[PDB]
Each structure stands twice: as C-alpha cells, then as structure tokens.
Amino acid sequence: TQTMKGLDIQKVAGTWYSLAMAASDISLLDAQSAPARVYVEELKPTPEGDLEFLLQKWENGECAQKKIIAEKTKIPAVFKIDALNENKVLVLDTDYKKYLLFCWENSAQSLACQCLVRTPEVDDEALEKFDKALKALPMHIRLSFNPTQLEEQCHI
Amino acid sequence: GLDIQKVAGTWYSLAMAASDISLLDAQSAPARVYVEELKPTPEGDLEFLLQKWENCAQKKIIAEKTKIPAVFKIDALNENKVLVLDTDYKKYLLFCWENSAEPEQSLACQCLVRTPEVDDEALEKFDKALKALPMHIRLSFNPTQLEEQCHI
Numbered sequence: 638t639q640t641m642k643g644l645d646i647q648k649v650a651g652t653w654y655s656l657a658m659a660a661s662d663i664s665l666l667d668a669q670s671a672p673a674r675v676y677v678e679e680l681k682p683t684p685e686g687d688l689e690f691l692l693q694k695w696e697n698g699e700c701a702q703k704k705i706i707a708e709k710t711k712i713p714a715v716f717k718i719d720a721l722n723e724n725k726v727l728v729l730d731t732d733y734k735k736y737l738l739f740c741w742e743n744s745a746q747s748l749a750c751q752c753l754v755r756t757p758e759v760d761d762e763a764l765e766k767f768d769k770a771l772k773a774l775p776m777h778i779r780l781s782f783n784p785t786q787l788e789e790q791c792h793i
Numbered sequence: 794g795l796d797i798q799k800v801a802g803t804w805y806s807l808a809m810a811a812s813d814i815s816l817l818d819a820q821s822a823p824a825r826v827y828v829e830e831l832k833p834t835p836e837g838d839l840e841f842l843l844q845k846w847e848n849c850a851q852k853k854i855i856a857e858k859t860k861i862p863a864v865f866k867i868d869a870l871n872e873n874k875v876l877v878l879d880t881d882y883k884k885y886l887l888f889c890w891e892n893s894a895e896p897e898q899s900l901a902c903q904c905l906v907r908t909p910e911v912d913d914e915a916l917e918k919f920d921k922a923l924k925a926l927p928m929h930i931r932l933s934f935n936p937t938q939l940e941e942q943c944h945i
C-alpha cells in the first residue's frame with residue numbers, strides 16, 4: 638500500500654467526519670459493532686509528530702469514545718499503534734482543507750480504509766478520490782453515510 | 794430484449810448493494826439473500842429460488858411479467874418489483890429488488906454469475922451499473938463464500 642509523499646500532519650488538525658469506509662473483509666464493517674466500524678471525530682498531531690485519533694465506536698448499545706495515539710515512524714505517512722509492529726495507520730492522501738484518506742492495516746493481512754471530510758456534507762470529489770485510492774486494494778465491503786448520520790454520535 | 798428462457802438454471806450471488814446499510818449489514822438483514830436458481834415459467838414469469846441465513850432456509854418468489862420488458866412484480870399491491878438491468882446469459886446477470894412503499898424507496902441490487910468464481914468483468918459491469926444509484930452499502934464474496942451458500 639503506497640502512502641502520501643510530503644504529508645504535513647500539522648495541517649490535518651481539527652474535527653473530521655467519516656464519510657465512507659471500506660474493508661478487506663465483510664465482517665470488519667458490516668455490523669453496527671463491527672471491529673473496524675469506528676468514526677473519526679478529531680485528529681490532533683503532537684509537536685513530536687505523532688497523530689492522535691479521537692474515535693467513536695458502538696459498544697453494548699452505546700456510543701463509546703476512544704483516543705488512539707499513532708506514533709511516527711521513518712515514513713511520514715505511516716504510523717504505528719502497537720509495540721509489536723502488527724497494526725499501522727497509513728495516510729494515503731489529503732488536500733488538508735476538505736478530505737483525508739487513511740487506512741488501518743494489520744499484518745499479523747486485514748485493511749480498513751476511510752474517507753474523512755472537514756464538513757458534514759457528501760463530497761463527491763473526496764468519494765471519487767477514495768474509490769481511486771482503493772482500486773489496487775482487495776476490498777470486499779464499502780459503506781457511505783448521509784449528512785444526518787455524520788452529525789450524530791456513532792453515525793446513528 | 795431479455796430472453797427469460799436463457800437466464801434459466803444455476804446462479805451464484807457474487808456481489809450485493811443497497812440504498813440503506815441496514816438492508817445488507819447482517820446475515821439476518823432483509824436483502825441479504827443468495828440466488829441459487831432462476832426458473833422461467835411458460836407464462837413468462839421468473840421464479841427466484843433463494844437462500845437466506847436463519848439461526849440456510851430456502852425461499853421461492855415468483856416475479857410476474859408486466860407490460861414493461863425486464864420489469865417483474867412480486868406482490869399484488871405493486872409495492873415490490875424486480876428489475877433485470879443486464880445479462881449475457883452465459884456469465885453474469887445484474888438485477889435490482891425495489892420497494893416504493895412509504896416513507897422512502899428501497900433498492901437492493903445483485904451481480905449473479907454462472908460459476909462459484911470471482912469474475913472481475915461482471916463486478917466491473919455491476920460497479921458501472923451502481924454509479925447512477927444512491928447505494929450506501931456494497932459487498933462482494935470470495936470463491937469460498939460463493940461455494941458455501943448462505944454461509945460466508
């Protein structure tokens with residue numbers, strides 16, 4: 638999987654909306670509580686060059702919040718979220734002001750990718766770039782949300 | 794010009810899409826149904842032999858001919874319709890279930906193939922057909938899932 642060249646995480650700070658999601662395996666996304674069914678609410682880069690994700694997930698009939706620190710690696714668009722080097726975040730592309738494409742990758746190989754947007758509206762341009770970035774990846778499920786869903790906890 | 798006699802026989806559900814996530818987001822979901830066989834009737838109706846995951850249950854639904862070619866009605870209330878979008882008879886068939894009952898119209902589309910193998914050409918024609926439709930969930934199966942019927 639190829640990641641963005643020249644990513645500056647200081648420009649991705651702020652609140653985001655998970656507009657669309659895709660995964661390598663149906664069971665990663667299909668259920669409300671599926672493992673990769675996570676909604677990005679905020680990106681917070683640190684001065685050290687780590688990227689904190691504020692996530693929401695449906696768990697046991699409620700929306701739960703989770704913070705995940707993705708630690709910098711030698712690749713500016715590749716972040717590690719465990720000490721075993723099994724789980725990574727890959728930033729595929731961003732224009733900073735409208736959309737950001739990224740993937741969770743597990744090489745224990747499982748992949749779950751998202752199209753984030755800055756404003757809770759459908760962005761057909763961001764959706765086209767998402768589909769173009771996924772073309773070479775072995776996705777078996779895609780989901781997309783409406784503007785009403787983007788503004789509710791856990792996209793209810 | 795759809796020829797229902799040539800779509801007869803064995804099929805496999807390769808991919809599925811729907812207008813609403815909750816139509817396809819579980820094995821239990823209402824549109825999560827796998828086509829096993831199409832049987833044309835002498836009167837020009839199309840019987841769909843389906844399997845649905847419960848707790849694999851078989852279901853037969855008769856799609857009756859209408860005055861519009863490749864459009865079939867399932868009920869007498871004209872609420873549920875089957876649309877045949879495209880086929881080459883020998884490899885793939887694309888179709889959509891539609892329900893136009895209140896308050897919002899539901900749509901659920903499938904790509905069927907003749908053999909339990911992934912067909913990138915059929916999946917590309919399905920993807921192209923879905924581009925103009927307001928789908929919010931799409932799924933494709935691997936050859937293992939193709940052979941194991943309702944079990945994925």
Ligand SMILES: CNCCCN1c2ccccc2CCc2ccccc21
Nearest residue numbers: 672673675724741742743747748749
């Ligand atoms: C398989 N690892 C944990 C399962 C969920 N997970 C995924 C899913 C697909 C690919 C990679 C990952 C990595 C970790 C992660 C982080 C946040 C949400 C889901 C996931």
Ligand SMILES: CNCCCN1c2ccccc2CCc2ccccc21
Nearest residue numbers: 659776777778779808920931932933
């Ligand atoms: C492996 N590439 C499949 C391409 C088409 N495909 C997509 C597209 C984007 C994201 C996920 C998927 C997987 C399932 C699917 C189902 C139906 C039509 C297209 C697609």
Ligand SMILES: CNCCCN1c2ccccc2CCc2ccccc21
Nearest residue numbers: 823824826873890891892899900901
């Ligand atoms: C609303 N009908 C409930 C059963 C699900 N169903 C769907 C789903 C979405 C859109 C249309 C339809 C038409 C009827 C039908 C027939 C066979 C399987 C599922 C469905």
Ligand SMILES: [Cl-]
Nearest residue numbers: 642643644713
């Ligand atoms: Cl770089």
Ligand SMILES: [Cl-]
Nearest residue numbers: 779780929930
């Ligand atoms: Cl989708």
